[PDB]
Amino acid sequence: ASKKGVGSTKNGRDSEAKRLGAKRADGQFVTGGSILYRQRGTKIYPGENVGRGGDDTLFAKIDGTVKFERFGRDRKKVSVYPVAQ
RNA sequence: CUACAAGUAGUCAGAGCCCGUUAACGGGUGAUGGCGUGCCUUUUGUAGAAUGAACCGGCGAGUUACGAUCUCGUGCAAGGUUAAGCAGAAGAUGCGGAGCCGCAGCGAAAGCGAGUCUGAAUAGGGCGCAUGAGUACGUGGUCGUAGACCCGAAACCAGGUGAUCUACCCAUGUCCAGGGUGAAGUUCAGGUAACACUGAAUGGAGGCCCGAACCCACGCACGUUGAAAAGUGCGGGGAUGAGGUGUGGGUAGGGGUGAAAUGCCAAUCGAACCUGGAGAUAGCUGGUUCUCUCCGAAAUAGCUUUAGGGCUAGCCUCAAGGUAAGAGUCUUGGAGGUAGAGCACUGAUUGGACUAGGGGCCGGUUACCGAAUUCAGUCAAACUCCGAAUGCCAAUGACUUAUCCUUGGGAGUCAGACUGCGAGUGAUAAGAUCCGUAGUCGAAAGGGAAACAGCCCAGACCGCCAGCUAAGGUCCCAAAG
RNA sequence: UAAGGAACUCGGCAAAAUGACCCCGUAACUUCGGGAGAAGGGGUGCUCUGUUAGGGUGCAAGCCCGAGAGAGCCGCAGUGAAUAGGCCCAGGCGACUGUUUAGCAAAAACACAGGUCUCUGCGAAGCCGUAAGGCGAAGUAUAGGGGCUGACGCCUGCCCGGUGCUGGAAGGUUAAGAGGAGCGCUUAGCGUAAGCGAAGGUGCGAAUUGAAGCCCCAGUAAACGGCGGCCGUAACUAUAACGGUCCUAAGGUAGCGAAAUUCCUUGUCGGGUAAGUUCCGACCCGCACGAAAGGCGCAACGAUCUGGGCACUGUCUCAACGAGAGACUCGGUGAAAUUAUAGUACCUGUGAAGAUGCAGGUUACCCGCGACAGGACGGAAAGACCCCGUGGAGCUUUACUGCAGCCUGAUAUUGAAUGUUGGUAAUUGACCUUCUAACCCGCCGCCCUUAUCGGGCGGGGAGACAGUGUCAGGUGGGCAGUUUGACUGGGGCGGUCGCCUCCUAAAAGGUAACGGAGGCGCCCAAAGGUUCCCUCAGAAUGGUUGGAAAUCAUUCGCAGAGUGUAAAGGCACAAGGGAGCUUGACUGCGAGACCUACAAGUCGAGCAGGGACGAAAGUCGGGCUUAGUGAUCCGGUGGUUCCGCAUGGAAGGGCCAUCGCUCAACGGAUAAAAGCUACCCCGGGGAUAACAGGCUUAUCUCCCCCAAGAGUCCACAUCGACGGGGAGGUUUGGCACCUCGAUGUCGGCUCAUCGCAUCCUGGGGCUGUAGUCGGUCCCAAGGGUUGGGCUGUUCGCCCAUUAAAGCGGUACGCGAGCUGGGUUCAGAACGUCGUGAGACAGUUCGGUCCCUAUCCGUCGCGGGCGCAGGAAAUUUGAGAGGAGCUGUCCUUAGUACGAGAGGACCGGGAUGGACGCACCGCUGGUGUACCAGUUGUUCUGCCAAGGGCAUCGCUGGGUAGCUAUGUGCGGACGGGAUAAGUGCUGAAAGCAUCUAAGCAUGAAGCCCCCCUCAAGAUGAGAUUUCCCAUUCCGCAAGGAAGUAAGAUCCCUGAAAGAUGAUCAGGUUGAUAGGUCUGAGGUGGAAGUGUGGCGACACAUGGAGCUGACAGAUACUAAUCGAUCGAGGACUUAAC
RNA sequence: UGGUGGCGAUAGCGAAGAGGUCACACCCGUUCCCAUACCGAACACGGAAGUUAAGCUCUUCAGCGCCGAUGGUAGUCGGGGGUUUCCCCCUGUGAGAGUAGGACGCCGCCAA
RNA sequence: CGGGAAGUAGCUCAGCUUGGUAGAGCACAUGGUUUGGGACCAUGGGGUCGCAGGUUCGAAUCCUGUCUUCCCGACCA
RNA sequence: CCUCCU
């Protein structure tokens, strides 16, 4: 039984998935430090009491409630507001 | 009971006949009717045209020791406990405190100590304390070291036994009916100056010829649970030789011997045989024995000289805790770029208008192509000016439901299958392959789809000669139009 | 064994033929021997002459051997039986006789004589052994060992670059051992401390010295090996003697060549054949010949291989008969493999995808006996193939690591002199030479001593060498232990392996494939930090050089740019551009998060220390973000309020910092690793390949749609592009679902059976159908469908036929049916590849084919019971099987048709081929209890006549029976209904219209007709005839007994037969034997006579003899017996 | 008017007008602080002769851009069916495009 | 079918690996030399690197595709 | 080194 020779692919590579995106929900309580969003670039901007890390990670600078919110016409931010106290 | 019957041999229904018991809504037999593809192993899936068992009987597989750890029990408890040994029934027990564990941790260590280490630090942080139980013994679960659940290699090494078979050799014997051919040499004759050379006779060479014994083994047939573990029959080859054969001897296994085939070395040879190391090792195959109950998987991820193995995680179970932390639905908020769609970007692309420019044809002209621009029009996994349904993450109560988490003991699983839906690979093939998602099978019997793991309906604790329905059905087989 | 004679087959395998002696005669070729038993022919008994000639023995007598003749005699035949070469032509291979895989290979393999290379000066080399001791060899270069080649003949070219071997040693490099310049630790002592530091001890240690080897220089190919491209060129073309150029150590000479080598390939041409994939001869595009792994020849030789002839034949056409051994029946004895239990049908389907057992149907009374193998994926053997195992073993090597051996140095044993030449002016190393006294002697004499051992003594030789010990370097598949990855739509081979980005990815996250695309293993001292300022691509227009595009100016300008680098996400309050100052490209950390099996990975506000920039606010722990990397162990370097084995130190460790991995197979097995196995083995797998099956149908085969064209015209007679749609499931595949505790695998043979897509024959439509022929389509599966050459072949080509030479399925139908050529083990060889061991759907020569049938199934044959009494016959036919083919000639008619050429339908008739049934009168075959001839020997005493054995001894005939090649006969003639087709009438639809109502016609096909079986046809049928209603038990229901008609046991047998069965008979009986008479067969008995010297001939006499054949005849045997076998249920209806 | 904010361009472009004592500009200088990879252009320091031409402020406008329903349609969760590369049905949900329409600014605080 | 290697002037070859320059021999052309050829001497010219696309400021050179011509492989069944 | 044919 004859078997035709076959070629090869020059593809077959991919990097590890980086588990990007939202890490806390709108309206969820977070502690200071909590990563809110992982991203390349600013898909979402740091709002009130939120920071942008060296790799564009958005994180809560205080304890409080996460609010994702429209930032002008085209953009989005995420903010953390203190609880009513 | 049985000669018109289609048989995993029963089971349920059932006359007839024959009986009469541990006296029971009894026993034997069984015309006929319905249903019904053994058991085990291994599998995605086995009635399997895969595996195992002729039958019956007996025998035949998680053990024990010493350590570790957990649960349970008991004694004592900030303590607990003795070992060897001595005495004593091979005993209990008494003595024996050496030793061991615990009561304090932190640090690599010096060391400090309810703290300590890091650090320049009264900082912060790590591990501890505060947040207190151990220890001795026993049973049980599991682990470790031992053959460690049982059976099974091919092999490896050590020490031996074999050349009464066979290989070659050594010493010493012996065998080979018959027939043929006619080398050298010699003689004689011829022959020449001598020799050459010629003829005839003689002579008896030879891994010479034909052919019995003997040895061999070329062809065919037969035989193939044989007359025979290599033969017989008919033919065949050698048959004075590198011959056959007897007796007595020699060479021995990491070795001999080989006119060389890895041949032969006692029916064994790519390394003999026997015993031992030895219960070698086997991530492999097979097997692993009483019952019922409660619960009940996986066939995945990651890493692996890894891919049919393993480990951690996932999923199961048991206990103790926490406890109500889980889940469904409604409501509310949010992240996100798929389906669709669109052309705003990138790329592809059709027609018209339009010409820069190029090409045929004279700085001049053409049915030849044309960039841009413009009008209209198509398309896209790696296009997006847009953008759902769902799914996901949460919050908030409400209505409902009972899960959920932690710690510890014990696993198994890492071959999956098909079906529907969304993709890739393929040829928009495969009962194909590879993901995603739901189901069923696996591990699920019952009804339907003739039969038919995976489809449709539906989850078997038992009994009933009750009833209602599901899918699918209602002329007869075959319940109901 | 008729006729034939290789047609058989892979192949003349097997068989047949040949065969003794004497004589004649005998070719090519040759190594002059051979070839040769070449070939091809002739003779062959017996009698007499004849106790021949002649010979041996002997005094003779005699005995023995014995040609060659002549004359006869007999037979079918005289080596009368048994035993006893077939031969020839040509080629390959090996020169030859030998040898070999005990037990699948006898060969082309091995050996061989011969050649050559090479080593070896004798304690030889080589080999065995640790050594002693040995072999070598009681040999000595004309000898011995090793490698290669393989008689003989002619020959044996080129390359020394590589590798090996040999020689060389000027230099380089290199060990132990010498050597000890320095340095460290320690501490007497000295120092307020810090430090310094004598001596000693101790730990390191540089220069220098140091052999062989290696590098290096040469040589060597009958050492290992190797021995080229491209382009141009001649006055026809073609080809290029000739030239150019690149490369090499050198480019393959002679010879041979489609080959044991040639893929393409059945090369081409010639020969041989009717036909030749093989064979021989040529040619040369030598895939991939080639000169001692020899080249080319070659007489002789071969159980060698190949091709062709003569002879010969049962090899075959195509089979028939006979003998014996089994088989079969009876008596005796009596295993085995296998086995889940089996009351064990068929079809189609289903299903783990190929069912006795499942479904639905169809069929089937119960039990055997002889037979056959289709199935039980039959038995046998835990598949040798293939894969897998971090399983083995054997083998290889420039795999790794070792070891033996060998070489080389140092040092000990080991001493004495002499010069010479290096540090050190007198002391120590190196070197050369000499000595003798160690050591050695496989030298001599003497002694122990009857001794080729050993020892002693004395000579001689050699000599501080050698040998040996220790240490060291080199060499070293000679030997040893091992390694030699995984993924993978089987494995190998190719590719890949970690990290980053995108898509696939189904709008969270995640998500596979040997899916689709790309990047990375860095870079930057600014391309980092901060402060301040800024805006890009491109276009248009103007303008020196200057263009399409340099720099300048204006205008337009969400970015069409840029962002170190891939991509994505981002970025114009810039994250893009510019400038100033800087080093936060910080140290200690770090609430809390993300990610996650772990190990790791990511983000982080904030705190402290000390800074950079900024007036300040503030920002800064590298870079727009996301790659740019690697665990542990081990080791190095720096630091250190740590440890420091009595103490002080130190050595060494710890801790912090940091360095060394294409550990890239990137979670890294080791510091250190490649191959072959067809000599292979074990554990496993249908988890995974090869055969067959299944799914699929790309490919394949077939059929269609559209209709552009072709066809003068004309798409559609015929063909049909571009495109489109299917069917089938015979191809190659894809997939990997059954089977690896075995599903034997190509072709052929034997036996078929099915489909129809039809090859022929039958029936038709259309035709570019005049006729005869055809083309094309439709119906049709009844029957039929050849023998050869070549090749293992399927296929194909060819020869010759034929009505035709169909295509497919059935596990590529059929190996428990056969074969075994091929494929597919072990041997050997060629080309080729490989350093090698070895390897090749390349080739070549050779190479073990097991099984007693249980079940179903198939073919035959019995027994049982049934079929409302028991019997004997004859039957109907539900139903089943069989058969089913076709040519040629004559005639119609040279008619129809046609210019002619040619030449029919339809219809008559005759006769064949192939096939089948029966049968032996005919022709033949066979004919083992028939007749005859004949050889040898042996027996019946001898002669004569006979018997036995030699294949039935052989040879010539042959009866019955059984038989084909022999004879006879068959498929005839028709009905019925139909297919395609043709219609008639006829409307729907005023017409038309084969159809809707109605009515026909019409195939080798369907149902009959013809032949056979058939009532288990459980639906058990019918007709005719026979027996006759018994007895006893019983309430009857039943039961028992003896019988009738009839049958059987037993017996004689054959027309029957494995056995049963069947049939003819069983005494008023011709059943068989015998007997008698015949037929046929043989061919002329014995005895006697006559003739002849005799072998023999003739007569008596178509005699004698004669299995199975015919008739007759109770002479013999079928004796006497016994056994079995009805008394007929009930109901209803008509009588 | 000026400053300074918040709100998705409904705020923007573009077009046509109107306005300036003060305020905001342009404007006029380079002695000084400071400045230009050259340039007092800009930045900086100073001034007030001029001017609303431009910026700025205020009107008007729907050409471009922006915002944008309702209905319908595509798609689709769930449930069924079929002639199954795909399609249909039913209770939900529901775009994009297109369009009606909106829109040439809305809301602060301070100073004058 | 799978894997390689080439492709540069008329012909044969370098250059490619390292991006910036198109070389070399023979041939060709012109002159000289010769009675005339040949040889010899002197002096010149000739591609845009197979084709297409890409990366780059820039491609014979780096990347891809394609075409042509060679070479190797196609094993176990 | 060569020197077309008659």
Ligand SMILES: [K+]
């Ligand atoms: K039953």
Ligand SMILES: [K+]
């Ligand atoms: K099996």
Ligand SMILES: [K+]
């Ligand atoms: K602390």
Ligand SMILES: [K+]
């Ligand atoms: K306790």
Ligand SMILES: [K+]
């Ligand atoms: K155990």
Ligand SMILES: [K+]
């Ligand atoms: K051996």
Ligand SMILES: [K+]
């Ligand atoms: K699925």
Ligand SMILES: [K+]
């Ligand atoms: K041999």
Ligand SMILES: [K+]
């Ligand atoms: K032949």
Ligand SMILES: [K+]
């Ligand atoms: K021969």
Ligand SMILES: [K+]
């Ligand atoms: K099965």
Ligand SMILES: [K+]
């Ligand atoms: K059978």
Ligand SMILES: [K+]
């Ligand atoms: K496959």
Ligand SMILES: [K+]
């Ligand atoms: K690895």
Ligand SMILES: [K+]
């Ligand atoms: K098969």
Ligand SMILES: [K+]
């Ligand atoms: K069709």
